[PDB]
Write an enzyme that holds these catalytic residues in place. Structure first.
Site, PDB file in Angstrom:
ATOM      1  N   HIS A  40       0.825  -1.287  -0.082  1.00 26.02           N
ATOM      2  CA  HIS A  40       0.028   0.096  -0.054  1.00 26.02           C
ATOM      3  C   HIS A  40       0.822   1.217  -0.040  1.00 26.02           C
ATOM      4  O   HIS A  40       0.137   2.316  -0.289  1.00 26.02           O
ATOM      5  CB  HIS A  40      -1.022   0.128   0.996  1.00 26.02           C
ATOM      6  CG  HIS A  40      -0.665   0.495   2.495  1.00 26.02           C
ATOM      7  ND1 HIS A  40      -0.154  -0.673   3.557  1.00 26.02           N
ATOM      8  CD2 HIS A  40      -0.777   1.554   3.121  1.00 26.02           C
ATOM      9  CE1 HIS A  40       0.022   0.069   4.337  1.00 26.02           C
ATOM     10  NE2 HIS A  40      -0.242   1.432   4.484  1.00 26.02           N
ATOM     11  N   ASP A  84      -0.065  -7.678   1.742  1.00 25.79           N
ATOM     12  CA  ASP A  84       0.621  -6.218   1.753  1.00 25.79           C
ATOM     13  C   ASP A  84       2.083  -6.293   2.110  1.00 25.79           C
ATOM     14  O   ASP A  84       2.399  -5.861   3.143  1.00 25.79           O
ATOM     15  CB  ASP A  84      -0.189  -5.546   2.796  1.00 25.79           C
ATOM     16  CG  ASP A  84       0.257  -3.838   2.654  1.00 25.79           C
ATOM     17  OD1 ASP A  84       0.399  -3.182   1.758  1.00 25.79           O
ATOM     18  OD2 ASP A  84      -0.324  -3.084   3.644  1.00 25.79           O
ATOM     19  N   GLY A 175       1.142   6.689   8.835  1.00 33.15           N
ATOM     20  CA  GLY A 175       2.419   7.338   8.455  1.00 33.15           C
ATOM     21  C   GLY A 175       3.522   6.208   9.157  1.00 33.15           C
ATOM     22  O   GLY A 175       4.678   6.260   8.584  1.00 33.15           O
ATOM     23  N   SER A 177       3.118   3.003   8.391  1.00 36.10           N
ATOM     24  CA  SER A 177       2.965   2.152   7.340  1.00 36.10           C
ATOM     25  C   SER A 177       4.100   1.458   6.534  1.00 36.10           C
ATOM     26  O   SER A 177       5.077   2.496   6.006  1.00 36.10           O
ATOM     27  CB  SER A 177       2.006   2.776   6.182  1.00 36.10           C
ATOM     28  OG  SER A 177       0.802   2.919   6.457  1.00 36.10           O
ATOM     29  N   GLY A 178       4.352   0.396   6.427  1.00 39.03           N
ATOM     30  CA  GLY A 178       5.497  -0.353   5.664  1.00 39.03           C
ATOM     31  C   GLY A 178       6.654  -0.451   6.587  1.00 39.03           C
ATOM     32  O   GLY A 178       7.698  -1.187   6.283  1.00 39.03           O
TER      33      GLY A 178
HETATM   34  C1  LIG Z   1      -9.733  -2.621   5.643  1.00 38.20           C
HETATM   35  C2  LIG Z   1      -8.483  -1.657   4.829  1.00 38.20           C
HETATM   36  C3  LIG Z   1      -8.815  -1.591   3.257  1.00 38.20           C
HETATM   37  C4  LIG Z   1      -7.195  -2.260   4.852  1.00 38.20           C
HETATM   38  O1  LIG Z   1      -8.623  -0.225   5.363  1.00 38.20           O
HETATM   39  C5  LIG Z   1      -8.814  -0.036   6.776  1.00 38.20           C
HETATM   40  C6  LIG Z   1      -8.198   1.312   7.296  1.00 38.20           C
HETATM   41  N1  LIG Z   1      -8.673   1.511   8.402  1.00 38.20           N
HETATM   42  S1  LIG Z   1      -8.751   3.204   9.108  1.00 38.20           S
HETATM   43  O2  LIG Z   1      -9.397   2.792  10.202  1.00 38.20           O
HETATM   44  O3  LIG Z   1      -9.049   3.699   7.809  1.00 38.20           O
HETATM   45  C7  LIG Z   1      -6.793   3.423   9.428  1.00 38.20           C
HETATM   46  C8  LIG Z   1      -6.602   4.875   9.883  1.00 38.20           C
HETATM   47  C9  LIG Z   1      -6.099   5.183  11.191  1.00 38.20           C
HETATM   48  C10 LIG Z   1      -6.030   6.342  11.410  1.00 38.20           C
HETATM   49  C11 LIG Z   1      -6.372   7.546  10.920  1.00 38.20           C
HETATM   50  C12 LIG Z   1      -6.854   7.326   9.342  1.00 38.20           C
HETATM   51  C13 LIG Z   1      -6.666   5.970   8.877  1.00 38.20           C
HETATM   52  C14 LIG Z   1      -6.503   1.108   6.953  1.00 38.20           C
HETATM   53  O4  LIG Z   1      -6.000   0.768   7.967  1.00 38.20           O
HETATM   54  N2  LIG Z   1      -6.168   1.504   5.962  1.00 38.20           N
HETATM   55  C15 LIG Z   1      -4.666   1.608   5.446  1.00 38.20           C
HETATM   56  C16 LIG Z   1      -3.994   2.172   6.559  1.00 38.20           C
HETATM   57  O5  LIG Z   1      -4.457   3.553   6.760  1.00 38.20           O
HETATM   58  N3  LIG Z   1      -2.685   2.098   7.130  1.00 38.20           N
HETATM   59  C17 LIG Z   1      -2.167   2.617   7.928  1.00 38.20           C
HETATM   60  C18 LIG Z   1      -2.226   2.123   9.559  1.00 38.20           C
HETATM   61  C19 LIG Z   1      -1.207   1.799  10.157  1.00 38.20           C
HETATM   62  C20 LIG Z   1      -1.285   1.288  11.421  1.00 38.20           C
HETATM   63  C21 LIG Z   1      -2.794   1.136  12.120  1.00 38.20           C
HETATM   64  C22 LIG Z   1      -2.774   0.775  13.292  1.00 38.20           C
HETATM   65  N4  LIG Z   1      -1.975  -0.033  13.866  1.00 38.20           N
HETATM   66  N5  LIG Z   1      -3.724   1.099  14.141  1.00 38.20           N
HETATM   67  C23 LIG Z   1      -3.769   1.560  11.212  1.00 38.20           C
HETATM   68  C24 LIG Z   1      -3.595   2.220   9.880  1.00 38.20           C
END
Ligand SMILES: CC(C)(C)OC[C@@H](NS(=O)(=O)Cc1ccccc1)C(=O)NCC(=O)NCc1ccc(C(=N)N)cc1
Ligand SMILES: [Ca+2]
Length: 223
Positions: A40, A84, A175, A177-178
């Site tokens: 991603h 991912d 942020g 991520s990865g």
């Molecule tokens: C089901 C799927 C398509 C996978 O998307 C779910 C989505 N969840 S969300 O709740 O949108 C992720 C998010 C968390 C905080 C602020 C903004 C966004 C999500 O996580 N999207 C990707 C993303 O934002 N990844 C970054 C990330 C990294 C860590 C965490 C964590 N450990 N809580 C969550 C998201």
């Protein structure tokens, strides 16, 4: 990283920042020429930044190296984030030193209860937003799939694991991520997804690196 701590400069020497004009993702150096990150995190024009602590100041230990090739896993599903994982080949070999070092790939997967180190420059707040300029760290255990699924109602594929704290308060975040999840000296996870950050019964979800080691090795051998 929410509820973590300042790592200390270059204490996580395999941690990279991916930069496309700004930091947008982490990654992990796995040898002098290759970085593992999340699928991603794919975009064109990635510069890999090694040896970073403060991402806004040149402190003297950095190496900035352009990606020559990016390889997203063949089965990456952008709707569910299954598989991912992405490999990035560096245009030139990193000069390995005490502050710029590779991390080993697993020989075996890690079990529930195993403690791991998660790191990154992501958001440090569960509500609202503040982006640190230095690297943050968090110690967190792998959770069992069953306890994770029952607490969260998430679908956890075989290529994912949950880690963190069901009580909330400590988690990776946007942020991060990865970036790496390292357990007993092996890269077992990649920061992938979640629901919010550090919320009760919503632990972090991580790419299960041990399932990809054969793919990584074969890909490196042929590229
Ligand atoms: C089901 C799927 C398509 C996978 O998307 C779910 C989505 N969840 S969300 O709740 O949108 C992720 C998010 C968390 C905080 C602020 C903004 C966004 C999500 O996580 N999207 C990707 C993303 O934002 N990844 C970054 C990330 C990294 C860590 C965490 C964590 N450990 N809580 C969550 C998201
Ligand atoms: Ca810097």
């Amino acid at each position: 990283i929410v509820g973590g701590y300042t790592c200390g400069a270059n204490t996580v020497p395999y941690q990279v920042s991916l930069n496309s004009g700004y930091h947008f993702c982490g990654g992990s150096l796995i040898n002098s020429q290759w970085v593992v990150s999340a699928a991603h995190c794919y975009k064109s024009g990635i510069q890999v930044r090694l040896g970073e602590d403060n991402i806004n100041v040149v402190e003297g230990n950095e190496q900035f190296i352009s990606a020559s090739k990016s390889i997203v896993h063949p089965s990456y599903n952008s709707e569910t984030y299954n598989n991912d994982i992405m490999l990035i080949k560096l245009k030139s070999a990193a000069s390995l030193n005490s502050r710029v070092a590779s991390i080993s790939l697993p020989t075996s997967c890690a079990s529930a209860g195993t403690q791991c180190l998660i790191s990154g420059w992501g958001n440090t707040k569960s509500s609202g937003t503040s982006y640190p300029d230095v690297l943050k760290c968090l110690k967190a255990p792998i959770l069992s799939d069953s306890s994770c699924k029952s607490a969260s109602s998430f679908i956890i594929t075989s290529n994912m694991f949950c880690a963190g704290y069901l009580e909330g308060g400590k988690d990776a975040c946007q942020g991060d991520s990865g970036g790496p999840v390292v357990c007993s000296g092996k890269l077992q996870g990649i920061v992938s997804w979640g629901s919010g950050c550090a919320q009760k019964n919503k632990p972090g979800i991580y790419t299960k690196v041990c399932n990809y080691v054969s793919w990584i090795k074969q890909t490196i051998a042929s590229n």
